[PDB]
Design a protein around this ligand. Sequence first.
Ligand SMILES: CC/N=C1/N[C@@H]2[C@@H](O)[C@H](O)[C@@H](CO)O[C@@H]2S1
Ligand SMILES: CC/N=C1/N[C@@H]2[C@@H](O)[C@H](O)[C@@H](CO)O[C@@H]2S1
Lengths: 304, 302, 120, 120
Amino acid sequence: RRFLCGVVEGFYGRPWVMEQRKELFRRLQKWELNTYLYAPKDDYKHRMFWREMYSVEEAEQLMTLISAAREYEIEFIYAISPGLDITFSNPKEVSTLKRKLDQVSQFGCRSFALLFDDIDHNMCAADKEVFSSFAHAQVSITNEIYQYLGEPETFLFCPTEYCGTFCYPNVSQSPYLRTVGEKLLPGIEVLWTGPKVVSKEIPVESIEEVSKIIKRAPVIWDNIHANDYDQKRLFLGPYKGRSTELIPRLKGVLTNPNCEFEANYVAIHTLATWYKSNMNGVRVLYSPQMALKLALTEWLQEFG
Amino acid sequence: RRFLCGVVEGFYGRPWVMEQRKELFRRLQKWELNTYLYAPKDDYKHRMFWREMYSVEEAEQLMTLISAAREYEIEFIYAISPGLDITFSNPKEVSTLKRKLDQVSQFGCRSFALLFDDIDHNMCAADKEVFSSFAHAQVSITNEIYQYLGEPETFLFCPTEYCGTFCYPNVSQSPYLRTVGEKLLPGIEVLWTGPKVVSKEIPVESIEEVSKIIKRAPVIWDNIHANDYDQKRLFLGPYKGRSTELIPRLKGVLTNPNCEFEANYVAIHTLATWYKSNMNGVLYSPQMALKLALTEWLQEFG
Amino acid sequence: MEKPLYTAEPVTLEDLQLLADLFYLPYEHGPKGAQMLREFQWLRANSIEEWRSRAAKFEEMCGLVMGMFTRLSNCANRTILYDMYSYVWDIKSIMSMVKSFVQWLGCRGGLAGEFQRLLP
Amino acid sequence: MEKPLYTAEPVTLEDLQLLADLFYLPYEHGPKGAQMLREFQWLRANSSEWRSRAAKFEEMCGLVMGMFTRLSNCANRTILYDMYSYVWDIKSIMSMVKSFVQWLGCRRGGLAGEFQRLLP
Ligand SMILES: CC/N=C1/N[C@@H]2[C@@H](O)[C@H](O)[C@@H](CO)O[C@@H]2S1
Ligand SMILES: CC/N=C1/N[C@@H]2[C@@H](O)[C@H](O)[C@@H](CO)O[C@@H]2S1
């Protein structure tokens, strides 16, 4: 079946360079992972200044990167966060988005994502009049961009209510998630981080509740090893607190790891081990402590 | 009068990249500063594996860097630290050291420095024989390199007892310092960190105390903004705690700043404002110097 | 009416004067830094109408530390910011928690942080 | 007879194992570190078994320091520099904790830290 498993480079702070990125693909491949979601919050062209097109070199490097992804059998997903200053009802905006994603398509990209995370719930007057809710406006543009791109294989959407403790007034009774659940096209996959932003545990129970209201199984954007919130902490622990009983009940797991690129060996290693331990499971198999000794052994060789 | 005022990249941790170093010179030139002391502690080919000759790609890099220093009117002082594993008596060691510096001279370097700081005070049995005290061995190999290098205009020497709180019994009566003061050639300059490794203050009388025994004015290696003893701290404050009344009593001030190259604007700019304020011997206000520094910096962000 | 275009405000010399006082010297803090450290200790002890203005000023002072990071994070030259992101990021956060504390007083750092919390 | 050439012991698996327990997860400390804390908490709860524990605790502190020492001198300086600040700051707080435990029987952190301390 289809399962998206890898890393999401979606943190705040100094993003990763192309050399680092090509290495991530090399590691992702070696460990039998299959996806890379390009979403660095701090890229001007990605979020704040989303309208801007990539210059000759900017375009050159992304082309290279996208070609490396192909070369290591890693699915590259280009994400874009317009949600800050975008005017949904204005078609000039829709066309600017269309034109922006077109340039990326010309670099080799065939997988896309639209993110509306970490953005205020209030719409402007133009959007307020036209669209019934913020959910409605997002669902509209996303669906339009899905079809415009020629209904691609992998198309990802990120809700504003992306985790349990962000759903008003609760998960199952959310009008935002309901609108998404109903009106967002079935071909499009939805990102979820679990109960909290940085979930201690992601229970099967919670993935059922959210899978209901969105009328699809989510793609987890895991923040277990993310360290942006506290740059005085780093996480070398094993992937832990996500049952292998989740793999059948989900479309994928993308890990948002430490800002510090090199310190993600154990995190991406144990994740690969996790996934693989119940790959073909339909509906224990994974010891984090055992996954860790394996990760740390393979890592040790890198130091020499 | 010759006064060495500038920056020393002499900290532990990730060294600065060439393009940063090149930019450093533009900043130093702009602020009427003149020296740059190359001493990254974590450069393998400087401290740990000092014997290693530079590679071909590495050589091209240094050559360009020394050229940049010439273009920006900055004196490039190349330092080497053998202290860890050198066998002072074995002339094969002294020969290898001579071969290394000879390579560096081919790059376009005219100023050198021999560093004997943050090293075990114990001599090997072989050296113990050939030389009286540790200072005798150090003064010997230094004078030899100084002379062999055709007695350069600028030759710096860093003693092991580089501050007051490191001098046994004390500064005025240290048998190590006396050896340096007497036997070390009057041509060679001596590096000093003041009364401590990170001196809060540098009193004029402390510099008159050490000058007495070293028989010359020292060249300060300042650690006021150095942050390689808890990387949890950044220092954006102004050069402070050193009298403009020290400038005529010193041969220089080279500041060892924050490891984060961008973080050193305020510390270099304020060092400049300090030196400039009284080159010829309340002329300086840290609080004032800081505002000046901060107004200049604001331009780099836009 | 439409949605306002994202605009970044520039770094002020005031932002940089706060930044230099927050990360000052190894032996002392900048006047603005020590002043803020004082005002938090005084407002902690007390639980008059003066505490209203003093907590209100402090919440605004904490807000500048936040603004400073936003504007530093938004300028074109990321190089300066990123070269000392860790440091600026932390203070901004600690100051944001400290902002909430004072608001609530009117109605982290990891393992090394844990051992440093037990030392005298 | 002569001074032995500089050489460094490579990184052991036990080093990595300790490292990973120090910088473990966001909701849990690694076994070794969790333990390493309980001991320092206990030796700070008494000042007169104790002397045998403190001897075994100082051993652990040395391991942390040695871990840094070998981690740094390794060939791959890319890995090191990528997480230097973390390992250095753990190494340091261990020295000042070891030194404080030696003193117990034989008888910093910035402004951001000073603000963190004055919180529950
Ligand atoms: C899919 C959910 N999007 C999110 N965006 C932010 C990310 O930018 C952070 O890196 C992450 C860790 O601090 O937490 C939230 S979760
Ligand atoms: C002339 C004295 N040499 C020294 N070398 C070390 C440097 O590498 C450090 O950067 C400095 C600040 O921590 O402290 C000592 S002083």
